[PDB]
Amino acid sequence: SIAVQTHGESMLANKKDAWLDSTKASRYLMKTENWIIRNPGYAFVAVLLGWMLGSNNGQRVVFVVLLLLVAPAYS
């Protein structure tokens, strides 16, 4: 699939808008938030799981966010 592999920010200096800059914020997050909205139970189980294998409050939230981001990607 070609559309999944995206030419990112061009290294060329540019005081203008690139090819699709209206979707710069959305394109990296639309599918993740959509999948989360369709799968609340995974959100809850990931929150619960991030507490299990942590060791303090600092590094449990990191686990929770990492799990919440790694599942919507790779479907």
Binding site: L20, S22, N39, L49, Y74, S75
Partner: protein, 496 residues
């Protein structure tokens, strides 16, 4: 209707009825004592009256483009083409000064509108439950050659087979199988295809069976069935760098290929004024209390046989062969058996051709006989004395290996069907009645927590659960995670 050259079939021992789950392109053979062995299969399923639920654009076109411009600090530009429905409009801002037009320097607002036309669209339709139409084939083994075993123009002409339609209006039907009697079946078309979690999506000439949520979530300009105005049109448009008097708009190229990539995992169907697909399942119940043996009083054939067609493995630990009979006498039983050795000629195997016979009186008849020998070395024996002919057969497997294979087939059948898999070959009983009721709650608890997930994600989550359960304490939360991680890995590897 018939399943001989078919890769995947299941075998079901008999007491007066049995319920089965006819899967997509598999078959079932039902052996019973003092019954003809019969095979049943769901050939296809159909929808006929589909009503549109949505359309999605994937090739859009911009017709005419206008830009209304205002000087800096004069407010916001407003294109009058915002009052017309077929126009997509966006507000940008461009540099303005004395060289551009105006008397003040700075960021002056502009409003650009482009006329939106849709060239090609993908149409999503739905199925009403009262229009699913299963085609089901049933066949009685009888006495067939190899050039009529799957014809069905001879099996129907010998009252040994039937294709019939199952509809929610008429979930049950009886088939007259000649001297074998009657075979009845009542199905569950309502509990067949879910038909309420699927759309039929047509893209050009390619039709797919898509999920409802996925079809509802496409990022494409969509519209109501009969309507013509579109929503979310800006997905297919690009407004380039703003210009004071002329900012251009380009329609993006056809998203048909991107849509095809998105359709990965959809089930291709063949919409030809009626949806026809050969997958899914249908849970039925077959009655064979009116099914009797044919020719219980023929007697044995007297003259010699031959191997008109060599014994062949079928892949399901079963053998098939074809005997030519030199006898000119009428119908007669075939004296054929499977023995451990040509000395001590006792039968040790069970035959699924259900008391074969030479149904004709004309000589040189050809009869297909199909039987299941045991593991190890066996002999196919037909005839006696000087006329006895023999064939050495070998079966490679073992009983424990077969048990493991059956266990994994059952595990992946539960994976495929979930709860209806508990109705596969059931005869009632509290065991299945409670296994279904516990699989329902466990499947709900598992599906609210791991539905909508791909094999990589579930495999990694299961591996993490194994790691955690090994490190788990209290031995009570440990086993729960061990089971869940085992299930996730089994699911992740079941498709590769």
């Amino acid at each position: 209707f018939n399943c001989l050259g078919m890769s995947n079939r299941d075998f079901l021992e008999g007491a007066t009825w049995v319920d089965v789950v006819l899967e997509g392109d598999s078959c079932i053979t039902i052996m019973a004592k003092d019954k003809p062995t019969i095979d049943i299969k769901m050939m296809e399923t159909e929808a006929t009256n589909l009503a549109e639920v949505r359309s999605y654009c994937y090739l859009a076109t911009v017709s005419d483009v206008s830009t209304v411009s205002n000087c800096p600090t004069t407010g916001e530009a407003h294109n009058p083409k915002r009052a017309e429905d077929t126009y997509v409009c966006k507000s940008g801002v461009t540099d303005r000064g004395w060289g551009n037009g105006c008397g003040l320097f700075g960021k002056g607002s502009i409003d650009t509108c482009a006329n939106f036309t849709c060239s090609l669209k993908a149409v999503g339709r739905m199925i009403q439950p009262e229009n699913v139409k299963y085609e089901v084939g049933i066949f009685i083994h009888g006495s067939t050659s190899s050039d009529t075993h799957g014809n069905y123009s001879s099996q129907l002409g010998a009252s040994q087979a039937g294709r019939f339609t199952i509809t929610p209006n008429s979930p049950a039907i009886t088939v007259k199988m000649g001297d074998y009697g009657e075979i009845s079946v009542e199905c569950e078309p309502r509990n067949g295809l879910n038909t309420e979690a699927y759309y039929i999506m047509s893209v050009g000439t390619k039709h797919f069976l898509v999920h409802r949520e996925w079809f509802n979530d496409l990022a494409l300009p969509w519209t109501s069935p009969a309507s013509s105005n579109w929503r979310n049109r800006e997905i297919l448009l690009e407004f380039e760098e703003p210009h004071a008097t002329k900012q251009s708009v380009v329609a993006l190229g056809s998203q048909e290929g991107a849509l095809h990539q998105a359709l990965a995992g959809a089930v291709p169907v063949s919409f030809s004024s009626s949806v026809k697909l050969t997958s899914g399942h249908l849970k039925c119940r077959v009655k064979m209390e009116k099914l009797t043996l044919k020719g219980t009083t023929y007697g044995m054939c007297t003259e010699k046989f031959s191997f008109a067609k060599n014994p062949a493995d079928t892949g399901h630990s079963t053998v098939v062969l074809e005997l030519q009979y030199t006898g000119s006498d009428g119908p007669c039983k075939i004296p054929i058996s499977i023995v451990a050795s040509l000395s001590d000629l006792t039968p040790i195997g069970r035959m699924v051709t259900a008391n074969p016979y030479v149904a004709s009186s004309e000589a040189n008849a050809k009869v297909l006989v199909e039987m299941e020998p045991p593991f190890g070395d066996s002999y196919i024996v037909v005839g006696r004395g000087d006329k006895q002919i023999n064939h050495h057969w070998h079966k490679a497997g073992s009983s424990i290996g077969k048990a493991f294979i059956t266990t994994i087939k059952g595990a992946q059948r539960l994976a495929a069907l979930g709860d209806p898999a508990w109705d596969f070959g059931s005869v009632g009983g509290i065991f299945n009645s409670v296994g279904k009721a516990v699989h329902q709650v466990f499947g709900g608890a598992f599906r609210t927590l791991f539905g909508g997930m791909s094999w990589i994600t579930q495999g990694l989550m299961g591996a993490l659960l194994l790691w955690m359960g090994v490190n788990a304490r209290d031995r009570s939360i440990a086993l729960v995670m061990l089971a869940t991680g085992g299930v996730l890995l089994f699911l992740a590897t079941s498709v590769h």
